[PDB]
Amino acid sequence: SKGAAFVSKQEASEVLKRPRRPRREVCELNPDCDELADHIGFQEAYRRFYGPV
Amino acid sequence: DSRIGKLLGFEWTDLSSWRRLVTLLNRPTDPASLAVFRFLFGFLMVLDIPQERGLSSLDRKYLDGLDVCRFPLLDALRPLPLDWMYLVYTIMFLGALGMMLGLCYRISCVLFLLPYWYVFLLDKTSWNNHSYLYGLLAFQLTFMDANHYWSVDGLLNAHRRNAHVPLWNYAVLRGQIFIVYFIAGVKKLDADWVEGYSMEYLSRHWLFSPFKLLLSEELTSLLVVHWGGLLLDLSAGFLLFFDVSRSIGLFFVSYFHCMNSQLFSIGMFSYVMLASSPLFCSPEWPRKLVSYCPRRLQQLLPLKAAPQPSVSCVYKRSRGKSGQKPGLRHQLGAAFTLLYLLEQLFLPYSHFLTQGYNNWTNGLYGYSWDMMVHSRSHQHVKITYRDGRTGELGYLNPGVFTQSRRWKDHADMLKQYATCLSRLLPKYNVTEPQIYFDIWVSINDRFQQRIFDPRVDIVQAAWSPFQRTSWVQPLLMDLSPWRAKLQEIKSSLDNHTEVVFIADFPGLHLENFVSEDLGNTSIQLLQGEVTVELVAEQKNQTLREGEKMQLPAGEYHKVYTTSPSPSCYMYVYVNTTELALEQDLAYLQELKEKVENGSETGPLPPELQPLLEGEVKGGPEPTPLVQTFLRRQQRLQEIERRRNTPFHERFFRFLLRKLYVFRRSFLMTCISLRNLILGRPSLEQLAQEVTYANLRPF
Numbered sequence: 001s002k003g004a005a006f007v008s009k010q011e012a013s014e015v016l017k018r019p020r021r022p023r024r025e026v027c028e029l030n031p032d033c034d035e036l037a038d039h040i041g042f043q044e045a046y047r048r049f050y051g052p053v
Numbered sequence: 054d055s056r057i058g059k060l061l062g063f064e065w066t067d068l069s070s071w072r073r074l075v076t077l078l079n080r081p082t083d084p085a086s087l088a089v090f091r092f093l094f095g096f097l098m099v100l101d102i103p104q105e106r107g108l109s110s111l112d113r114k115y116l117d118g119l120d121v122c123r124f125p126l127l128d129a130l131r132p133l134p135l136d137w138m139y140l141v142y143t144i145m146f147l148g149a150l151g152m153m154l155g156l157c158y159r160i161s162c163v164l165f166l167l168p169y170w171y172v173f174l175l176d177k178t179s180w181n182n183h184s185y186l187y188g189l190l191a192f193q194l195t196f197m198d199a200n201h202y203w204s205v206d207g208l209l210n211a212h213r214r215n216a217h218v219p220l221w222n223y224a225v226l227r228g229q230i231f232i233v234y235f236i237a238g239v240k241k242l243d244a245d246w247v248e249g250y251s252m253e254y255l256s257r258h259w260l261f262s263p264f265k266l267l268l269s270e271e272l273t274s275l276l277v278v279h280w281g282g283l284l285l286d287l288s289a290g291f292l293l294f295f296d297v298s299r300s301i302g303l304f305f306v307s308y309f310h311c312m313n314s315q316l317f318s319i320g321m322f323s324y325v326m327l328a329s330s331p332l333f334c335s336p337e338w339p340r341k342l343v344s345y346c347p348r349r350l351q352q353l354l355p356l357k358a359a360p361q362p363s364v365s366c367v368y369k370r371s372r373g374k375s376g377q378k379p380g381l382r383h384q385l386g387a388a389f390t391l392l393y394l395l396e397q398l399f400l401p402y403s404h405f406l407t408q409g410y411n412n413w414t415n416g417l418y419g420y421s422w423d424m425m426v427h428s429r430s431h432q433h434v435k436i437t438y439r440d441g442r443t444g445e446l447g448y449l450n451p452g453v454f455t456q457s458r459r460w461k462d463h464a465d466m467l468k469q470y471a472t473c474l475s476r477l478l479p480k481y482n483v484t485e486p487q488i489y490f491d492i493w494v495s496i497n498d499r500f501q502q503r504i505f506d507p508r509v510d511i512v513q514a515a516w517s518p519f520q521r522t523s524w525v526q527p528l529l530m531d532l533s534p535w536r537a538k539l540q541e542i543k544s545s546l547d548n549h550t551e552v553v554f555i556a557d558f559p560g561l562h563l564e565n566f567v568s569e570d571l572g573n574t575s576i577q578l579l580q581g582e583v584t585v586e587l588v589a590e591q592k593n594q595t596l597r598e599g600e601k602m603q604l605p606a607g608e609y610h611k612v613y614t615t616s617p618s619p620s621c622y623m624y625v626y627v628n629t630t631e632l633a634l635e636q637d638l639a640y641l642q643e644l645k646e647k648v649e650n651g652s653e654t655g656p657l658p659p660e661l662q663p664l665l666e667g668e669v670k671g672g673p674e675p676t677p678l679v680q681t682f683l684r685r686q687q688r689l690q691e692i693e694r695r696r697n698t699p700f701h702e703r704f705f706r707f708l709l710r711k712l713y714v715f716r717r718s719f720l721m722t723c724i725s726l727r728n729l730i731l732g733r734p735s736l737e738q739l740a741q742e743v744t745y746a747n748l749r750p751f
């Protein structure tokens with residue numbers, strides 16, 4: 001529970017979880033995505049490098 | 054004169070000796086088609102750099118100070134800072150422009166080639182067939198004399214203006230395209246493609262609507278989608294070469310590539326293949342096309358006169374002079390052609406040497422030409438860590454310190470992730486850890502099953518590139534025919550119930566926690582012998598074939614496999630909270646309809662007044678049910694408005710979005726080039742410029 005990296009035992013052990021809100025993810029396609037901004041510590045690093053945006 | 058010589062373009066006697074082979078592979082040939090392909094390839098790469106290579110998104114992928122687990126092929130390689138990365142992409146753009154315009158052709162090809170492969174080898178998660186093909190094409194075109202026609206370098210140098218080129222330039226490209234088609238075709242001679250499993254759901258696209266006039270969906274998804282692709286791969290390999298079948302081959306290949314462009318989001322690969330198709334035609338088609346125009350167009354289009362003699366070709370001398378002895382560049386060209394084609398043939402089937410990268414599939418994805426053959430669906434990922442000092446056991450967020458999700462399918466990427474976690478966790482008050490992974494995945498709609506052993510410390514595990522990994526679970530192909538029966542079980546359910554099918558090894562066990570919402574959950578055994586344990590009272594029951602148990606909701610339970618063979622079972626569950634919410638929402642909507650149509654003359658309750666008003670102003674806050682109802686109604690109206698949109702608006706929004714991407718890429722590159730050259734200004738100026746760069750075009 002010490003930060004976003006760790007999770008509790010309950011949330012880790014739920015096999016029966018709703019994946020979306022449809023998976024079938026095939027390769028090839030197009031790797032790029034807009035989820036990169038959800039990384040840990042993005043806001044602080046972005047503020048250090050490009051200032052108070 | 055011989056029929057074989059006419060069909061294949063060379064006589065048998067040309068192959069009798071090495072010198073005749075060099076002369077054949079360096080005969081004069083017209084340069085026009087090669088120049089057209091060079092221009093088209095350069096233009097498509099220029100359009101592709103700011104879109105798929107990730108220049109627009111590069112500010113949020115290599116950000117300095119951020120702690121990320123990389124996946125390079127060589128651990129020695131590391132990214133440079135962000136500014137030097139933008140400089141690298143700028144050099145890539147200049148190289149692509151130079152290739153397109155044919156200005157300083159060799160230098161431009163090198164400047165495109167070296168950075169492209171630097172970026173390609175840096176991250177294994179961005180690998181795919183159509184990036185490998187672009188890299189190979191850039192590698193080939195570095196050596197080919199493709200600037201001899203319709204090139205600025207011709208204008209600046211008379212010797213390279215409308216000149217002959219050796220035949221092997223065309224031969225290598227034709228061989229590459231043939232290898233792509235044929236290897237893709239043979240790779241699709243798999244049980245999962247000929248039987249209709251891979252790409253089973255693509256037949257519902259509206260592009261396949263006319264085929265449904267004569268065929269059912271089940272046949273349309275097999276004869277047309279699957280067998281058609283295989284037949285077209287092999288035939289388009291073979292038809293385009295011969296003159297008799299070139300027209301039909303071109304038609305079928307063009308239709309195939311257009312449909313692939315519309316169905317998938319592969320990118321510029323369809324257009325690149327379309328641009329590569331004409332090379333099988335005669336080498337002089339642009340010249341005759343230019344000839345068949347009015348004089349006014351001819352004053353602007355390239356030259357139509359016959360090409361001049363060159364120095365990079367072996368010329369047969371019919372003046373009585375002795376034939377020109379081949380020098381060194383001709384022998385080097387012939388050797389390069391032969392060795393390169395042999396290597397290209399061998400490399401897709403080189404998986405028996407690099408066995409460390411082998412998995413349920415073969416080798417890393419990107420250089421096997423096995424496109425849309427395997428589809429994977431992951432269910433659960435659990436990452437456990439044991440501290441090396443106190444002994445505490447904890448669990449990590451599955452996607453922590455990562456930007457892709459292909460590490461769930463490859464042992465080497467798993468090892469790199471484990472090492473990254475080992476180095477990074479000491480910042481979070483954790484001593485030397487032991488990390489365990491538990492990943493469930495199913496390929497082409499099989500039983501979901503473990504892929505790595507969950508009892509092996511990956512940090513201290515053994516891995517080498519050229520030896521088989523000992524902690525990768527085998528794929529059970531014996532359970533393949535069950536995919537028939539399971540599908541029937543998928544069709545016997547209500548609109549609320551859901552089913553998940555599991556297969557497990559002997560010895561191992563699965564611990565699960567059914568959430569409080571999933572009431573009325575049941576477990577049924579399909580094959581093998583398992584024991585289900587409830588830890589609330591420590592009671593374990595052994596289940597035989599065709600037995601069902603009602604599991605508790607909101608507690609922990611375990612399933613142990615206790616048979617000599619793997620055991621297959623199934624969880625069938627329904628979400629009670631969603632059902633109750635749906636019933637309450639339906640009741641509320643029914644009351645609303647009664648109010649609207651004039652029934653229910655009595656005064657409405659106060660909680661219903663916000664629904665009729667539709668706005669929370671000057672009153673108590675709405676209950677959660679009212680908020681959910683309003684949110685659902687607003688979402689449904691938004692979707693309905695989105696559906697009712699004319700085509701021109703969609704096209705305009707598409708163009709505006711693309712313009713936004715290009716503008717953002719250019720501005721960020723300019724900012725960082727200024728930072729590199731003139732230094733870094735104050736923070737306020739940087740913030741202002743970055744705010745300006747992100748502005749929407751409108």
Ligand SMILES: C/C(=C\Cc1c(C)c(O)c2ccccc2c1O)CCC[C@H](C)CCC[C@H](C)CCCC(C)C
Binds near residue numbers: 278279285286326
């Ligand atoms: C998605 C498909 C194949 C994967 C693929 C892709 C995406 C490529 O980019 C390829 C490029 C070059 C070489 C191979 C590639 C490849 O394998 C099947 C798509 C099938 C298509 C939708 C079916 C319609 C066309 C068929 C052939 C018409 C036949 C009509 C019969 C009556 C003869």
Ligand SMILES: *[C@@H]1O[C@H](CO)[C@@H](O[C@@H]2O[C@H](CO)[C@@H](O)[C@H](O)[C@H]2NC(C)=O)[C@H](O)[C@H]1NC(C)=O
Binds near residue numbers: 573574626627
């Ligand atoms: C609990 O879920 C089960 C499935 O896990 C459902 O059982 C269905 O009950 C109806 C009752 O009329 C039968 O017609 C169906 O055949 C049953 N489905 C099966 C066996 O898969 C049901 O939704 C839930 N039952 C209760 C009592 O809550």
Ligand SMILES: *[C@@H]1O[C@H](CO)[C@@H](O[C@@H]2O[C@H](CO)[C@@H](O)[C@H](O)[C@H]2NC(C)=O)[C@H](O)[C@H]1NC(C)=O
Binds near residue numbers: 584591614
């Ligand atoms: C219920 O039965 C299961 C079936 O094996 C038991 O699992 C074993 O548990 C013991 C300790 O109790 C372990 O040493 C064994 O390794 C377990 N077996 C396997 C195959 O892993 C479980 O313990 C039993 N539970 C109770 C409360 O008696």
Ligand SMILES: *[C@@H]1O[C@H](CO)[C@@H](O)[C@H](O)[C@H]1NC(C)=O
Binds near residue numbers: 002480481482
């Ligand atoms: C534990 O980690 C927290 C959060 O990173 C940090 O503030 C602190 O330094 C650590 N505490 C100890 C006692 O090491």
Ligand SMILES: *[C@@H]1O[C@H](CO)[C@@H](O)[C@H](O)[C@H]1NC(C)=O
Binds near residue numbers: 017
């Ligand atoms: C079950 O339904 C509820 C309805 O609110 C939803 O929040 C939840 O995500 C669903 N899944 C689980 C595992 O509870």
